[PDB]
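Please predict the structure of the following assembly.
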Amino acid sequence: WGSIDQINGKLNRVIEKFHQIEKEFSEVEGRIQDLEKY
Amino acid sequence: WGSIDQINGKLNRVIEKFHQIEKEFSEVEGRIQDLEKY
Amino acid sequence: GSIDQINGKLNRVIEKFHQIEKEFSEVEGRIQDLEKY
């Protein structure tokens, strides 16, 4: 990547995808609670 | 320096969040292990 | 050098993210397995 603008664009894409992984992780953690809870 | 400092700041905040999430993954793995074992 | 250091740091973030994606996928697969069998 040659420009600041491009590095920032790529970083934003990572951030957006990560936002989604965090949400999915939260949902998985809930499913672990349910299994523990029985 | 303004653009470089802002990109660095943002990258550092991402890196920190990723270190946090890895700690949470470690804890969740422990809980999965307990469900698999017991 | 800066653009180079920034690129390096971005590449490390990207790599870490790919690791995270893989860990999460492995975690989810184990939960799935526990849920069914």
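The interface with chain B takes residues 4, 7-8, 11, 14-15, 18, 22, 25, 28-29, 32, 35-36 of chain A (CB under 8 Å). Helices of chain A lie at 4-37.
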